[PDB]
């Protein structure tokens, strides 16, 4: 759907920083896109347009960069936003999922009352790398009886194989900006 | 220009309160129940955008992570850039930092040096104003880069902790939707 001029504007809006966080890493920085009101609005409008007819009842966004894309997408779809958070940050009853980091593991939590049977959920995050956090988030949603088949991202690091990993869990990914490298 | 009684009631009733979180003797005001209610969440964003539509804001700064959920939709509603202020070691480009006092220790916030220019007029957004310590440090980051900040907006004001007065004395006018008593 989106024009060359639009996709090139979004790809050009994202700074890449060599040797962050360590030598030999090319970091894709979405904060330059957030600072540009044309790039930020275009990115939210394109994600909303993709899902306007999917019957989404809830958007789930991952802490913390995913909040910046999932919450505007919730408002554009006319639905509730549910955060999945690092441990200890949600105040009411939660469930937890563990996922791999580059170094060791960590947890994501969700409020148990945030998703129920008959919900259809979209997961939104800034960037698809391993897809570890998304696999964890999908497991939280399904444990509460929610349906999820869709994840949406600004950036797709397509050399890291996150998309095929999610396809095997029944998730279709939509991404605006593909970048090579790992 | 302000919430009606019906709107204030609806927003206040959309917020759940949790005793003895995150420590005993605090009554935690939880915005997640407002976020999950599309009527409450859209209303909250509409009321903040309306307040600043004529204020000449050039940038919105939102503090990590609950502030992101209100500052980002306000930035989009105003048609202006969003700048996150984050916990240390998350922002990848050149930063400056501020250290501030919490009840049981110190906390640190960072901002990208290139995100704020002299002449920028900045609105700061967070979910909840308590002592004002967090927003005070955020305002220092913005002012150290030459940004001009006269305005902070919140969903919730804990009016007993006098954050509003602490901020007005720093040239920051607060706009908050839901007042609650207590700490
Ligand atoms: N913003 C980013 N830009 C570039 N590489 C990234 C970014 N975020 C994560 N990675 C890389 O993806 C892997 C981490 O995967 P994950 O644990 O899914 O974040 C490592 O190889 C990281 O260097
Ligand atoms: N009762 C409370 N309910 C929820 N959040 C709180 C409460 N008291 C303080 N906070 C949060 O704690 C941090 C410290 O607030 P401040 O004292 O304004 O720096 C901010 O993120 C506030 O939003
Ligand atoms: Cl993050
Ligand atoms: Cl659990
Ligand atoms: Cl937070
Ligand atoms: Cl009360
Ligand atoms: Na490498
Ligand atoms: Na009007």
Swiss-Prot record, chain B:
It comes from the Bacteria. Keywords: Cytoplasm, Glycosyltransferase, Purine salvage, Transferase. The keyword Glycosyltransferase applies. It is found in: Cytoplasm. Homodimer. HAMAP family: Aden_phosphoribosyltr. This is Adenine phosphoribosyltransferase. It comes from Escherichia coli (strain K12). The lineage of its organism: Bacteria, Pseudomonadati, Pseudomonadota, Gammaproteobacteria, Enterobacterales. The gene is apt.
């Amino acid at each position: 759907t989106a024009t060359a001029q639009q996709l090139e504007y979004l790809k050009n809006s994202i700074k890449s920083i060599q040797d962050y966080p360590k030598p030999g890493i090319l970091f894709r920085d979405v904060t330059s896109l957030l600072e540009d009101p044309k790039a930020y609005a275009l990115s939210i409008d394109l994600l909303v347009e993709r899902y306007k007819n999917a019957g989404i009842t809830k958007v789930v966004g991952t802490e913390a960069r995913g909040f910046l894309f999932g919450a505007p997408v919730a408002l554009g779809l006319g639905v509730g936003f549910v955060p999945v958070r690092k441990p200890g940050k949600l105040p009411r009853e939660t469930i937890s999922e563990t996922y791999d980091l580059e170094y060791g593991t960590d947890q994501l939590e969700i409020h148990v009352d945030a998703i129920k049977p008959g919900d259809k959920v979209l997961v939104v995050d800034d960037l698809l790398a391993t897809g570890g956090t998304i696999e964890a988030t999908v497991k939280l949603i399904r444990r509460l009886g929610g349906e999820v088949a869709d994840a949406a991202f600004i950036i797709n690091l397509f050399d890291l194989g996150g998309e095929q990993r999610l396809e095997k869990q029944g998730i279709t990914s939509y991404s605006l900006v593909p970048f090579p490298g790992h």
